[PDB]
Amino acid sequence: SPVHEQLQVPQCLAAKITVPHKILAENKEFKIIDVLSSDVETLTILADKVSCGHFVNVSHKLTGTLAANQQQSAQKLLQKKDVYEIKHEEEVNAALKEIVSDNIWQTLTHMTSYYNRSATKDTGVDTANWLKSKFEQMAVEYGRTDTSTFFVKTGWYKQPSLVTVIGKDIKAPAIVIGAHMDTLDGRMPGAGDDGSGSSSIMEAARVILSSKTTFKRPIYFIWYAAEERGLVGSQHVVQHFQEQSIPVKAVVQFDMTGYRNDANDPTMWVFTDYTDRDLSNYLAKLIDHYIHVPVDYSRCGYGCSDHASWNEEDIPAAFPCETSFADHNPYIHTSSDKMDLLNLEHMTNFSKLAVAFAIELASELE
Numbered sequence: 624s625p626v627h628e629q630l631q632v633p634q635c636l637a638a639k640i641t642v643p644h645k646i647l648a649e650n651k652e653f654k655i656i657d658v659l660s661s662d663v664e665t666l667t668i669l670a671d672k673v674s675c676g677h678f679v680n681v682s683h684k685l686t687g688t689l690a691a692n693q694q695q696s697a698q699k700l701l702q703k704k705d706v707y708e709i710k711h712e713e714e715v716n717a718a719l720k721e722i723v724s725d726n727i728w729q730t731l732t733h734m735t736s737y738y739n740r741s742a743t744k745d746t747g748v749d750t751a752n753w754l755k756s757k758f759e760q761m762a763v764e765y766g767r768t769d770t771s772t773f774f775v776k777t778g779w780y781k782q783p784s785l786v787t788v789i790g791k792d793i794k795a796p797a798i799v800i801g802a803h804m805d806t807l808d809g810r811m812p813g814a815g816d817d818g819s820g821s822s823s824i825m826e827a828a829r830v831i832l833s834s835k836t837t838f839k840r841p842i843y844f845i846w847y848a849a850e851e852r853g854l855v856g857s858q859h860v861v862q863h864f865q866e867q868s869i870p871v872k873a874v875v876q877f878d879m880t881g882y883r884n885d886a887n888d889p890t891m892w893v894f895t896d897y898t899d900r901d902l903s904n905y906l907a908k909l910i911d912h913y914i915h916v917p918v919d920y921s922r923c924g925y926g927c928s929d930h931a932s933w934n935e936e937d938i939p940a941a942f943p944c945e946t947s948f949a950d951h952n953p954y955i956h957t958s959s960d961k962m963d964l965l966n967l968e969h970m971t972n973f974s975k976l977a978v979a980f981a982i983e984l985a986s987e988l989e
C-alpha cells in the first residue's frame with residue numbers, strides 16, 4: 624500500500640543517504656534507488672546541505688514499454704546550429720514599460736497564503752486552478768483571442784501542470800517560458816522558491832496578452848507541477864509535447880527570482896550546466912542589453928530545475944537565477960522562505976527578461 628518511487632541520484636549525494644532504500648542500479652556517476660514516497664522530502668533537505676546536486680524522479684521511465692523488471696530497466700537507463708540575435712528593440716522596450724511590479728507582489732501574496740502548494744495536496748490543485756483562471760481572466764480583459772489553456776496530468780500526483788499558449792494555431796516551433804508552482808509538504812510559504820518565478824512569468828504573460836502583435840511562433844507559459852518531487856511535472860509536459868508532436872525552439876526556466884544576496888547588487892546569474900550554451904549566452908546578452916544590470920555565471924548540479932527535463936531531450940534550454948549557487952537563499956524549503964526576504968526590483972527584472980526573451984525569439988522564424 625505505501626507508494627514507492629524511484630530516483631536517480633548523483634553518487635556524491637547517494638553516499639550520504641541514511642533513509643531506508645534499495646539500490647536498483649549504479650554506475651560511476653549515479654545510483655538509481657527505490658524509496659518510500661514519504662521519504663523523498665528528507666532527501667531534498669539533505670541535498671540542500673550536501674550541495675553537490677539534487678535528484679530526478681525516474682519512476683515513470685522505469686514503467687516504460689518493452690521492459691521486464693525495474694532493476695533491469697534501471698540498468699539500461701544508466702548504461703554507456705541555431706542563431707540568436709537582438710532585432711526587436713523598439714517593441715521590447717515598449718513592452719518592458721508595461722510591466723507592473725505591484726501585480727507580481729500581489730500574485731506572490733496570494734501564492735504564499737496557502738499552507739503549502741505540495742503536489743500531493745488539495746492546495747496544490749487549488750494553486751493550479753487559480754493560475755489557470757487568472758490567465759484566462761487576463762486574456763478576456765485585454766481581448767487576446769488566440770489563447771488556450773490545458774492541464775497536463777502528473778500520474779498519481781493530484782496537482783497537474785498548467786500549460787497556456789498565446790497563438791494556439793501558429794504552426795511553428797514554439798517558445799516556452801516556465802516556472803514551477805509547487806512546494807514541499809509541511810508549512811511552506813515558498814515565496815522565493817518558486818512563488819517568485821511563478822509570479823514573474825505571470826506578469827510577463829499579462830504583458831504579452833495585452834499586446835496586439837501577431838508573432839511568428841506560439842508562446843507557451845507553463846507552470847509545472849511537482850518540481851520538488853524530482854522534476855515530475857516538467858517530465859510529463861515534455862512527454863506530452865513529444866506525443867502530440869509539438870515542436871519547440873527554445874525554453875527558459877524561472878526558478879527563484881527575488882532574493883538578492885546584497886540588496887544593492889542587482890546582478891543576475893546565468894546557469895551553465897544542463898543548459899544550452901548558445902541560448903545561455905543569448906540570455907546574458909538580453910540581460911545586458913535590456914535590463915542593464917551585471918551578469919555572472921554559476922552551476923547548480925544534477926536535477927536542479929525544470930529546464931533539465933527539456934535539456935535531456937536536446938531541446939535548447941536556459942536558466943537565469945536570482946543568485947549564484949554558493950550564495951543561494953538559505954531559507955529555501957523551509958517555513959522561513961517568506962516574501963520579507965525578497966526584492967521586488969529583482970523579481971521585476973526577471974519578469975522583464977521573460978518578456979524580452981518571448982518577443983525577440985517569437986518574432987523571428989528560422
Ligand SMILES: [Zn+2]
Binds near residue numbers: 817850879928
Ligand atoms: Zn524551485
Ligand SMILES: [Zn+2]
Binds near residue numbers: 816851956
Ligand atoms: Zn526547490
